[PDB]
């Protein structure tokens, strides 16, 4: 009925970053999260091992810098009433919206999650929801504009998702709350 789903990725440990922000680590504790959807770029099993301490169900797709080449390129999952698609995004050449709507139809999902830009974004179009959690470490990218650490928590109940977007802004964890309802 009620499911908390953690969505994160682009940690880039240890090449670009060595850990998640300590304030995030203090919030991410076992016993709460039912599933973890990861956009990839961990990049090593050490960060995979960390996620498995948080939840018994971890789903990951292959980022362009992951060490594990067995990770699938894309994943579709059904959680409650929602079909959720997952892809790292370094394959999306114009996060372009005509491409995302196409991917939404190809995966046949209510929610499409992707990463690779390290910029948190979320929007709704025609009763489909598109999420990018950003980088949970605030890892640098090419030509960046600052790059705030961020991750996403989805609160899924019946046909409503309430998404909480956690961001490390200055010295504080700050949150935005999003509602997504499907017909």
């Amino acid at each position: 009925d009620r499911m908390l789903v953690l969505v994160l990725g682009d940690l880039h440990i240890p090449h670009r970053c060595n850990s998640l922000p300590a304030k995030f680590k203090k919030l991410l504790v076992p016993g709460k999260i039912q599933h973890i959807l990861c956009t990839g770029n961990l990049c090593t099993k050490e960060s995979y091992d960390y996620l498995k301490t948080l939840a018994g169900d971890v789903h990951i797709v292959r980022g362009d810098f992951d060490e594990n080449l067995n990770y699938p390129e894309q994943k579709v999952v059904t959680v409650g009433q929602f079909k959720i698609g997952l892809i790292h995004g370094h394959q999306v050449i114009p996060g372009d919206m005509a491409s995302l709507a196409l991917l939404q139809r190809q995966f046949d999902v209510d929610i499409l999650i992707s990463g690779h830009t390290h910029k948190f974004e979320a929007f709704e179009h025609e009763n489909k929801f598109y999420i990018n959690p950003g980088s949970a470490t605030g890892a640098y990218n090419a030509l960046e504009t600052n790059i705030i650490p961020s991750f996403v928590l989805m609160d899924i109940q019946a046909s409503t998702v309430v998404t909480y977007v956690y961001q490390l802004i200055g010295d504080d964890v700050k949150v935005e709350r999003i509602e997504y309802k499907k017909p």
């Binding site: 964890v173 700050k174 949150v175």
Partner: peptide, 16 residues
Amino acid sequence: XIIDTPLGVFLSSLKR
């Protein structure tokens, strides 16, 4: 202002 969340109470990140 502030927002209650499953992981605790935090400041809102909204620019307004």
